[PDB]
Design a protein around this ligand. Structure first.
Ligand SMILES: C[C@@H]1C[C@H]1C(=O)N1CCN(c2cnc(C#N)c(-c3cnn(C)c3)n2)C[C@H]1C
Lengths: 164, 910
């Protein structure tokens, strides 16, 4: 009316399924370290890029200043003969511009790494999501076999030696 | 490498690039800069050096005006070595504090602005105004009241001499005084060559004042029991002032609640399987209606559903704290992928409308394995760039926006609307029939059973708005409950704002001392909160601003979880608020934070070196790093994080070492010749939160025992999580592990450290402490107790360290160790008189903890917020019920304890 193997044989399988569980648990926990670690490394890159923007912003304010400030000034060095003081100002500005190119290049390099690390994150999260169903099924099997042997009346000491 | 090339942006647009030393302070770098700038164009147009401030992009990506030019470039620690000169003028008090807050709390303040969220902005506005106001108010008040704020009294729950002196004086006056002398009386006696003075325990920020005898103060109590003369300084009221300075109703929308499930984004699943979004509405833990599911759309990265999801609840029925919950699953024609929760009403009580993009949290496959996660946080995932997301849309209910009704209108539904024999049995000792029986007699529960409020809130049918109004009506006139009851009402089971407010109302009667015992649990409870502005946050802030110690430990409890995405935002905004009302204390916490950052750098070096090379060479190479200006000065002269009244003055590099654990803790020794040789352990690598809870609880037991006239000579030592797998332990000197003392031997060790008549004290100390830590470890279920993790003191006192596991994580028996029994009985085979006194201490101790059983159950129940591995469910809580036998009579419980005791004595032999 209610539709829903020897004890030693079911105990042998309880040993196996608990082992296969504990292996899979240790595996998922390794990935969850990587997930949490990489989540932190990505946030560090996401604010380091902000620090690159805010630096590159400040260098560009300097360029704006260099042009506004020199425009109203440099006409005096032209009419008063100093071609050399003009050329000093301009070289010093090309030296500024040249430096921005390094900072932009290093921002590009970081942006490349965070592109790679975002792909790693998603891959780690994907591999966790193909371990979850195995893990949960091994949990529930392990628990079914315990329930079976308990009902059959197996001593608590015997179940403990099978569990690890 | 020593030197770094720094880019210098002059205000004329000119650009200089030259190398400076990492150690060089900014004052010095400005001189070098000016010296090179004179040989660059447009120099004549600059003002003098002191007209300008350096500016850099700091480590948290914010601009920082570097006002303190005595700081080293390596401590300023800019992002790139780029320094800009700008003008000094502008309100740079606001600027300074905003910068200093960003570095102090971890998260930079721009990250709050960036979110473009009103809730955040209004919290930041209201709480910062509140905090700034209280600090302004604090400053105007007297030196007495300021001393109460800054250095609140450390009290304990015949006559000897005392060494008194004044500040700035070599001579010191010693004289006899009694235990029961109030502090002012001693000052009158000290005036021998009163109310414009206060005593200080020199070498420490601990002061003696108020109408309390000398024995009640911890410093005196500490010195008396030892048998030592206290050392004090008299300080003038003038000197403390030097310290002190520097329009349509919701109940007419009878149409079932529904949502449009548009899209999934950034999903990562097995392509053979197919995706299902499961969903449901919740109030606290209970379901408001049955859970509905989407169609099984095939696994891609960007799945599109576009389904209405009709729920079996009308929009009028939705309670204030309604909580829509999602879970994304991957099915084969079951893997939980992710989950996300959403509040249906916003912080302004408005029913949310329109599209909403929930960035989801990943599911963790747990033992319960539920469909949805209604306990989890409301906050979106901070990782908006990489995390999975659900695009959904809450429909337009009406042309006008609709709010959840105001209290005047809630109470208006209250204004419309033999049996006791069954009710007493149910409350005075719930299932289907009983829940109704309480609800019918809900008026009688308020009248004769006010303590049963909690039971009554759960029987309330929160998925029908008529019920909800009636419960709230009763609640508004509900009599004030004791603290113990109010603690239960902070638990997640009671999510409604009106319950929260009542709970906090009843907690305002907490003294600062008592509030300190629960501060950790109260912090964790904030993880259950829905909205940023809440009553608990204002309460915690109120008490932090009124008391510097509470403020201190509030700071560290929150700071030490700033790495946890789920709480980073909520905790950041509170830390910002605290700091703004405690600018005085910011400066102390800055110094600690930097000391902590050097230790982390220092530990990481020791970790790496000890793998390669042996201990004595690694010990000396550690010292080399510590000798460096930046290191030595940052580690020197700071108030201890573990207790801000303690003073870590001069770091003793020779005594400084590290221990042989897996994570290799650093052992840092200090010295202060005003005091007297304090030390600390810097643990980095393991979680310390579980050790703290265990110590907090043993300390609570010690307090609980002491109140009933039982001092069991415990050592309630400090333990403080400061960060991500990082914290401190207070060193307790003249103490080693039993394992090391053993390499018979315990009693020999006590003999050598307590010669003559002092040995009888040391056995009494051992007996008393062995009792407390036997009962404590039994009650908390702390197994794995061996001589490697138990410690004796030279005084005789036993205490416990490295509480790795607890609450049985199978039942832990009561444990008597032969070696300890031998020492208890004074080295004899049979000393029944002594061993009976020891049995009585255990039984007395155990009796008193049962009397306060619900307190332990309530405090533990709130710690389920923290999500520690070994405290996650009702089974963990149930352990304490059974260990304290709270479902038995007092004598029945005590007879089982005796059977546990006696069988532990039998088990001791083998
Ligand atoms: C100076 C010498 C290098 C250090 C060393 O190797 N020692 C042996 C072990 N030991 C420990 C170990 N763990 C803890 C903790 N946790 C404590 C401890 C001390 N006080 N408290 C509240 C805990 N003590 C004592 C120390 C002398």
């Amino acid at each position: 009316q209610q539709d829903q193997d020897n004890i030693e044989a079911v105990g042998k399988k309880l040993h196996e399924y608990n082992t296969q569980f504990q292996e899979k648990s240790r595996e998922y926990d390794r990935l969850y370290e990587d997930y949490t670690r990489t989540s932190q490394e990505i946030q560090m890159k996401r604010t380091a890029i902000e620090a690159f923007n805010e630096t590159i912003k400040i260098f560009e304010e300097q360029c704006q200043t260099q042009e506004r400030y020199s425009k109203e000034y440099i006409e005096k060095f032209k009419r008063e003969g100093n071609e050399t003081e003009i050329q000093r100002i301009m070289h010093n500005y090309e030296k500024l511009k040249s430096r921005i190119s390094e900072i932009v290049d290093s921002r590009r390099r970081l942006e490349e790494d965070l592109k790679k690390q975002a792909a790693e994150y998603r891959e780690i999260d994907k591999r966790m999501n193909s371990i979850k169903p195995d893990l949960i099924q091994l949990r529930k099997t392990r628990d079914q076999y315990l329930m079976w042997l308990t009902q059959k009346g197996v001593r608590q000491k015997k179940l403990n030696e099978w569990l690890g | 490498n020593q030197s770094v090339v720094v880019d210098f942006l002059l205000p004329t647009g000119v650009y200089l690039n030259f190398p400076v030393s990492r150690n060089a302070n900014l004052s010095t770098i400005k001189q070098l800069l000016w010296h090179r700038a004179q040989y660059e164009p447009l120099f004549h147009m600059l003002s003098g050096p002191e007209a300008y401030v350096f500016t850099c992009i700091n480590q948290t990506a914010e601009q920082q005006e570097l006002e303190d030019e005595q700081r080293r470039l390596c401590d300023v620690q800019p992002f790139l070595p780029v320094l800009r000169l700008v003008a000094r003028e502008g309100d740079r008090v606001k600027k300074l504090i905003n910068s200093q807050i960003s570095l102090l709390i971890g998260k930079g303040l721009h990250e709050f602005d960036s979110l473009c969220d009103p809730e955040v902005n209004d919290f930041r506005a209201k709480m910062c105004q509140f905090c700034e106001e209280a600090a302004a108010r604090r400053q105007q008040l007297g030196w007495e009241a300021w001393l109460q704020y800054s250095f609140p009294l450390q009290l304990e729950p015949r006559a000897l001499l005392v060494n008194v002196k004044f500040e700035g004086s070599e001579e010191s006056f010693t004289f006899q005084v009694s235990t029961k002398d109030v502090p002012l009386a001693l000052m009158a006696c000290a005036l021998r060559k009163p109310e414009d003075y206060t005593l200080q325990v020199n070498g420490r920020h601990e002061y003696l004042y108020g109408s309390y005898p000398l024995c009640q103060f911890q410093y005196i109590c500490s010195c008396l029991h030892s048998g030592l003369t206290p050392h004090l300084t008299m300080v003038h009221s003038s000197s403390i002032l030097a310290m002190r300075d520097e329009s349509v109703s919701l109940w007419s929308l009878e149409q079932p609640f529904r949502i449009e499930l548009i899209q999934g984004s950034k999903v990562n699943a097995d392509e053979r399987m197919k995706l299902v979004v499961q969903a449901g509405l919740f109030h606290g833990n209970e379901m408001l209606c049955k859970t509905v599911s989407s169609s099984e759309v095939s696994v891609c990265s960007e799945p599109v559903w576009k389904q209405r999801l009709e729920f079996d609840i009308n929009i009028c029925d939705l309670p204030r704290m309604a909580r829509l919950c999602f879970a994304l699953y991957a099915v084969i024609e079951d893997c939980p992928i992710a989950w996300a929760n959403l509040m249906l009403f916003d912080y302004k009580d408005q029913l949310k409308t329109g599209e909403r993009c929930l960035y989801m949290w990943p599911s963790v496959p747990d033992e319960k394995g539920e469909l949805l996660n209604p306990t989890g946080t409301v906050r979106s995932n901070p990782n908006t760039d990489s995390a999975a997301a659900l695009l959904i849309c809450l429909p337009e209910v009406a042309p006008h926006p609709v709010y959840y009704p105001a209290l005047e209108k809630i109470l208006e539904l209250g204004r419309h609307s033999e049996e006791q024999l069954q009710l007493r049995e149910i409350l005075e000792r719930l299932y289907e029939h009983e829940k109704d029986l309480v609800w019918k007699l809900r008026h009688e529960v308020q009248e004769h059973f006010p303590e049963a409020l909690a039971r009554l809130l759960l029987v309330t049918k929160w998925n029908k708005h008529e019920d909800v109004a009636q419960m709230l009506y009763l609640l508004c006139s509900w009599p004030e409950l004791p603290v113990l009851s109010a603690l239960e009402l902070l638990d997640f089971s009671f999510p409604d704002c009106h319950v929260g407010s009542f709970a906090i109302k009843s907690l305002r009667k907490l003294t600062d001392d008592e509030l300190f015992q629960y501060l950790l649990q109260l912090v964790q409870v904030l993880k259950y909160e829905s909205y940023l502005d809440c009553e608990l946050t204002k309460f915690l802030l109120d008490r932090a601003l009124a008391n510097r110690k509470i403020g201190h430990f509030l700071f560290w409890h929150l700071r030490s979880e700033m790495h946890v995405p789920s709480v980073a935002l909520r905790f950041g905004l509170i830390l910002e608020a605290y700091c703004r009302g405690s600018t005085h204390h910011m400066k102390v916490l800055m110094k600690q934070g930097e000391a902590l950052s050097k230790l982390k750098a220092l530990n990481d070096f020791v970790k790496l070196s000890s793998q390669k090379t042996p201990k004595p060479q690694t010990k000396e190479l550690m010292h080399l790093c510590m000798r460096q200006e930046a290191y030595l000065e940052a580690l020197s002269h700071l108030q201890s994080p573990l207790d801000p009244s303690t003073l870590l003055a001069e770091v003793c590099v020779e005594q400084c070492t590290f221990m042989d654990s897996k994570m290799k803790p650093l052992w840092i020794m200090y010295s202060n010749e005003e005091a007297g040789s304090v030390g600390i352990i810097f643990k980095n690598g393991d979680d310390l939160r579980q050790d703290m809870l265990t110590l907090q609880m043993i300390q609570l037991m010690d307090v609980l025992w002491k109140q009933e006239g039982l001092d069991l000579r415990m050592t309630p030592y400090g333990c403080l999580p400061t960060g991500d797998r990082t914290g401190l332990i207070e060193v307790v000197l003249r103490s080693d592990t039993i394992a090391n003392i053993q390499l018979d031997a315990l009693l020999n060790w006590l003999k050598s450290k307590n010669p003559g008549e002092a040995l009888d004290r040391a056995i009494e100390e051992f007996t008393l402490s062995c009792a407390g830590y036997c009962v404590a470890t039994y009650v908390l279920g702390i197994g794995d107790r061996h001589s490697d993790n138990i410690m004796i003191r030279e005084s005789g006192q036993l205490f416990h360290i490295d509480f790795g596991h607890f609450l049985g994580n199978e039942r832990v028996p009561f444990i008597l160790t032969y070696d300890f029994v031998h020492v208890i009985q004074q080295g004899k085979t049979n000393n029944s008189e002594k061993f009976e006194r020891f049995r009585g201490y255990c039984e007395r101790a155990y009796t008193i903890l049962r009397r306060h059983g619900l307190l332990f159950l309530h405090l533990f129940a709130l710690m389920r917020a923290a999500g520690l591995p070994e405290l996650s469910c009702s089974k963990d809580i149930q352990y304490l019920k059974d260990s304290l036998a709270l479902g038995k009579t007092e004598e029945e419980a005590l007879k089982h304890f005796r059977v546990k005791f006696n069988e532990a004595l039998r088990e001791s032999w083998k």
